[PDB]
Amino acid sequence: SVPSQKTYQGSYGFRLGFLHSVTCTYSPALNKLFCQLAKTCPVQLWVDSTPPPGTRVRAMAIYKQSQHMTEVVRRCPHHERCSDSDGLAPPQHLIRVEGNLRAEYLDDRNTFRHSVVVPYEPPEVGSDCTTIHYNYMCYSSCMGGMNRRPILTIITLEDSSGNLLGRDSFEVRVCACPGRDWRTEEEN
Ligand SMILES: [Zn+2]
Secondary structure, eight states: OOOOEEEEETTTOEEOOOOOOOOOEEETTTTEEOOOOOOOOOOOOOOESOOOOEEEEEEEEESSSGGGGGOOOOOTTTGGGSOOOOSSSOOOOSSSEESSOOOOOOOOOTTEEEEEEEEEOOOOOOOSSSEEEEESSTTTTTTTTTTOOEEEEEEEOOTOOOEEEEEEEEEEEESSSSHHHHHHHHHH
């Protein structure tokens, strides 16, 4: 199957935000994030009202192109074996959450898809949003992995049972020079 990618603000008015940037830059025109391998990618979570205690935030990657959407996105044969473990993320997972000991990594028993989920934290004092720092652990160009195929990251706001409360998404290109590729794609 293929996880839904339909934007859904839900009852809490959930949506993502990105900084204005290089190692990580977001293009609103392309709804696409360009980043270097294993570098911090700040993603903001915005809500109109605070969701219930127990709400969680999950991130999962899927291939963007129809002919590849059914294939599970995972790290390539080289990166899954480089022992760059952080102590929590399984080595096959493309997406990691940085600096959160409550992050949980899932390998779905029915879809076999990977995801990382953390508890939703309401904004701190003096802040209007919550920021999650993600890392992408394989290049878009990795052979035997994404192999130049574009991916989408789907972020979902879920209740304590895992039911859907909100959804947003963005394309991602993990590359050596985000700045250059961003300009090229904006141009085209
Ligand atoms: Zn790789």
